[PDB]
Amino acid sequence: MHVEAMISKHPQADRSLVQCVEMCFDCAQTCAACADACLGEDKVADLRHCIRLNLDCAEICVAAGSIASRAAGTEESILRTMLQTCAEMCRMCEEECRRHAGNHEHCRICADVCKECETACRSATG
Amino acid sequence: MHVEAMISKHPQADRSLVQCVEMCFDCAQTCAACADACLGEDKVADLRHCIRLNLDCAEICVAAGSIASRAAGTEESILRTMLQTCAEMCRMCEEECRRHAGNHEHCRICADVCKECETACRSATG
Amino acid sequence: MHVEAMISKHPQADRSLVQCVEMCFDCAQTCAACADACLGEDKVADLRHCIRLNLDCAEICVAAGSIASRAAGTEESILRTMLQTCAEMCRMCEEECRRHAGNHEHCRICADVCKECETACRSATG
Amino acid sequence: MHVEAMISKHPQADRSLVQCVEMCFDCAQTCAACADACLGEDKVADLRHCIRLNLDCAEICVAAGSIASRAAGTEESILRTMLQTCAEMCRMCEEECRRHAGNHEHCRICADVCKECETACRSATG
Ligand SMILES: [Cu+]
Ligand SMILES: [Cu+]
Ligand SMILES: [Cu+]
Ligand SMILES: [Cu+]
Ligand SMILES: [Cu+]
Ligand SMILES: [Cu+]
Ligand SMILES: [Cu+]
Ligand SMILES: [Cu+]
Ligand SMILES: [Cu+]
Ligand SMILES: [Cu+]
Ligand SMILES: [Cu+]
Ligand SMILES: [Cu+]
Ligand SMILES: [Cu+]
Ligand SMILES: [Cu+]
Ligand SMILES: [Cu+]
Ligand SMILES: [Cu+]
Ligand code: NA
Ligand code: NA
Ligand code: NA
Ligand code: NA
């Protein structure tokens, strides 16, 4: 990614923010991938809630990553509110993915990414 | 829109929810349009914060409308948290658009739509 | 929606474009709803491809509607290319939803909306 | 990112695809960042078209990256069409960012990322 490079060249120009942006896109892609993999499983009926939570997590992580890419200045912003929402979403998604992690390696990877994004988003709210 | 029609045919099948979904997409489109119109104004330098807030509002309204389109059942969901975030975003965007409404009719229309979406999102959290 | 009202107040200021924008958001919401309803069906395993195509259609319709909301001027734009892609996507999604329409009323509604969006997007490329 | 790891664990389980997905998210974030930086410049009026093209590029790159994250199987997909559209979008955005690269380092970085994403998307269509 180019998050760090672009922040430094912004005319209104932060490690916690760079890490949060990176993780939001990483998590958005991973959740999209996890939902699609759950949809291909023989036992797809067992994974309905996990697919649904992945879909919401991918939507909220993209939104958060976009908002946070525009949060390099000092002006009022929705950033902290959005990051709290992303954190809560990632917490929910992680718990459900974690529950299937013994059965589906893709859900283990997704749960780990959601946990990391949750942590990153919380850290950026400081 | 087909929000009402699709909710009723959902196998896990609410006026406040239908109104919120409709308004989130209406507001997403209106904010996207408002940012683009502000970008075309002679006095674009005066509208920087308004463009930025429109961009964040369009992102959050789409996300909210998507999440709420999947919230027709009884299972745990990020819905209330997301709708509070949308409400707060629309409040911010409305205030800035409102400030330019005497000068730019497109900002008057956008402020009115943001106010309505804010109200709809708050009502759906009940 | 406020598409027509916002186009007329744009400083660079078209019926086919207003109809396309409206339909793209209508279709994005309807496909999101259809995927979520398919995920709740007893026979979810039979609907894997339909869910997947709905997810791609909702993503592409939002993108198209956003791009087209910014296409009110005369400058070079990705608009025609994006609308052709939306048309092709809606065609694919319609065919799969249509196949399940006798079994699931939500897929009948979605197929009808996808057909209309396809038509609208093609008309706006003129 | 976790693109490579998730592809390998997909029940329907490609270097060109992993590179395209990674680049689409990298480019989406970079274009979002570039538009926000152009909005903060003293000479924002000179950057209107660049901001607009960045906004469309961020929208199309996210959509492409999402679609391509679900393209790990053999079934019919919009993937090739979407990747051609992303390529064309990145080409347009690159040319405009490149034009400002002598004046704004953020536009130099964005033009380089758009060029790479364009190349990656074209390579994945093979
Ligand atoms: Cu997750
Ligand atoms: Cu999850
Ligand atoms: Cu997950
Ligand atoms: Cu995850
Ligand atoms: Cu607004
Ligand atoms: Cu606003
Ligand atoms: Cu506005
Ligand atoms: Cu507005
Ligand atoms: Cu469809
Ligand atoms: Cu469909
Ligand atoms: Cu459908
Ligand atoms: Cu449909
Ligand atoms: Cu670009
Ligand atoms: Cu560009
Ligand atoms: Cu750029
Ligand atoms: Cu770029
Ligand atoms: Na900002
Ligand atoms: Na739901
Ligand atoms: Na335009
Ligand atoms: Na697929």
| Closest ligand to the CA of C75 | 19
Would the annotation count A93 as a binding residue?
Answer: yes
Q: Which residues in chain B have Cβ-Cβ distances shorter than 8 Å to C106?
A: 6, 9-10
* Cα-trace Rg, chain D: 15
Amino acid code (one letter) for A30: T
Q: Which helix (H) or strand (E) holds D66?
A: helix D48-69
Contacts of C23 (CB under 8 A, 6+ apart): C113, C116, C117, C120, C121
Both structure tokens of D17: 């695809």
Q: Is B112 exposed, middle or buried (0-12, 13-18, 19+ CB in 10 A)?
A: middle
Q: Which residues in chain C have Cβ-Cβ distances shorter than 8 Å to A29?
A: none
Number of Cβ within a 10 Å radius of residue B76:
11
d(CA B21, CA A14): 36
d(CA B27, CA B124): 16
Both structure tokens of C107: 């897929």
Residues A45, C44: contact at Cβ < 8 Å? Answer: yes
d(CA C25, CA B26): 8
Both structure tokens of A65: 């990553």
Q: Is C125 exposed, middle or buried (0-12, 13-18, 19+ CB in 10 A)?
A: middle
Would the annotation count D117 as a binding residue?
Answer: yes
d(CA B93, CA B61): 11
Contacts of C115 (CB under 8 A, 6+ apart): C90, C94
Nearest Cα neighbor of B12 from B83, B68, B71 is B71
d(CA D25, CA D30): 8
Q: What is the resolution of this structure in A?
A: 1.6
Placement of tokens 């949308």 in the chain? B86
d(CA B11, CA A28): 27
SS3 at position C76: coil
Q: How far does D7 lie from chain B, in Å, by closest CA?
A: 25
The one-character DSSP state at B46 is G
C-to-N gaps above 2.5 Å in chain B, after residues: 13
Q: Do A78 and B63 touch (CB under 8 A)?
A: no
Contacts of C107 (CB under 8 A, 6+ apart): C34, C38, C50, C97, C98, C100, C101
Contacts of B65 (CB under 8 A, 6+ apart): B21, B24, B25, B28, C29
Placement of tokens 């759950």 in the chain? A38
Phi, psi of B57, rounded to the nearest 5 degrees:
-70, -45
Residues D46, D12: contact at Cβ < 8 Å? Answer: no
Q: How far is the CA of C3 from the centre of ligand 9 (A)?
A: 22
Nearest Cα neighbor of D93 from D104, D107, D77, D80 is D107
Both structure tokens of D120: 């990656």
Residues lining ligand 9 (ion), CB within 5 A?
Answer: C 31, 57, 93, 114
Placement of tokens 């570039």 in the chain? D34
Task: Work out the angle at residue D10's Cα, subtended by the Cα atoms of residues D22 and D30, and round it to the nearest 5 degrees.
Answer: 15
Q: Which residues in chain C have Cβ-Cβ distances shorter than 8 Å to B105?
A: 9
d(CA C89, CA D84): 14
On the CB side of B99, CA atoms within 13 Å amount to 13
SS3 at position C9: coil
Q: Do D39 and B52 touch (CB under 8 A)?
A: yes
Q: How far is the CA of B56 from the centre of ligand 19 (A)?
A: 18
Contacts of A58 (CB under 8 A, 6+ apart): A27, A28, A29, A31, A32, A35, D66
SS3 at position B25: helix
Q: Do C85 and D89 touch (CB under 8 A)?
A: no
Domain with D20, as residue range(s), is: 1-126
Residue-wise DSSP of C16-55: HHHHHHHHHHHHHHHHHHHHHHHHTSTTGGGGHHHHHHHH
What domain count does chain C have? 1
Q: Do A40 and C48 touch (CB under 8 A)?
A: yes
Q: How far does B15 lie from chain D, in Å, by closest CA?
A: 31
d(CA C23, CA C29): 10
Residues A86, A61: contact at Cβ < 8 Å? Answer: yes
Q: Do B40 and C12 touch (CB under 8 A)?
A: yes
Q: How far does A45 lie from chain C, in Å, by closest CA?
A: 6
Partners of chain B (3+ Cβ pairs below 8 A):
A, C, D
d(CA C113, CA A112): 38
For A3, B60, C16, the CA distances from C82, given in Å and listed in that order, are 27, 22, 15
CB pairs under 8 A between C and D: 56
d(CA D66, CA A33): 8
**Residue among C39, C45, C52 whose CB faces A52 most closely:** C39
Torsional sign, CA D121, D122, D125, D126:
negative
Q: Which residues in chain C have Cβ-Cβ distances shorter than 8 Å to D85?
A: 78, 81-82, 85
Residues A37, D6: contact at Cβ < 8 Å? Answer: yes
d(CA B97, CA B32): 13
Residue-wise DSSP of B58-101: HHHHHHHHHHHHT--SSS--SHHHHHHHHHHHHHHHHHHHHHHT
Q: Is D3 exposed, middle or buried (0-12, 13-18, 19+ CB in 10 A)?
A: buried
SS3 at position B38: helix
Partners of chain D (3+ Cβ pairs below 8 A):
A, B, C
Task: Work out the angle at residue A28's Cα, subtended by the Cα atoms of residues A116 and D125, and round it to the nearest 5 degrees.
Answer: 135
Q: How far is the CA of B42 from the centre of ligand 6 (A)?
A: 19
d(CA B110, CA B41): 15
Torsional sign, CA B123, A48, D11, C31:
negative
Task: Work out the angle at residue B80's Cα, subtended by the Cα atoms of residues B126 and C36, and round it to the nearest 5 degrees.
Answer: 110
Q: How far does A119 lie from chain C, in Å, by closest CA?
A: 27
Residue-wise DSSP of A87-109: HHHHHHHHHHHHHHTTT-HHHHH
Number of Cβ within a 10 Å radius of residue D125:
15
Residue-wise DSSP of chain A: --HHHHHHT-TT--HHHHHHHHHHHHHHHHHHHHHHHHHTSTTGGGGHHHHHHHHHHHHHHHHHHHHHHT--SSS--SHHHHHHHHHHHHHHHHHHHHHHTTT-HHHHHHHHHHHHHHHHHHHHT-
Helix D79-100 to helix D48-69 angle, to the nearest 10 degrees? 150
d(CA D2, CA B84): 31
**Residue among B49, B60, B81 whose CB faces A63 most closely:** B60
**Residue among A52, A67, A92 whose CB faces B56 most closely:** A67
**CA-CA-CA-CA dihedral for B94, D35, A18, D106, to nearest 10:** -150
Residues A107, A38: contact at Cβ < 8 Å? Answer: yes
Both structure tokens of C91: 């065609």
Residues D6, D28: contact at Cβ < 8 Å? Answer: no
Residues B30, C2: contact at Cβ < 8 Å? Answer: yes
d(CA A36, CA B113): 35
Phi, psi of A122, rounded to the nearest 5 degrees:
-60, -40
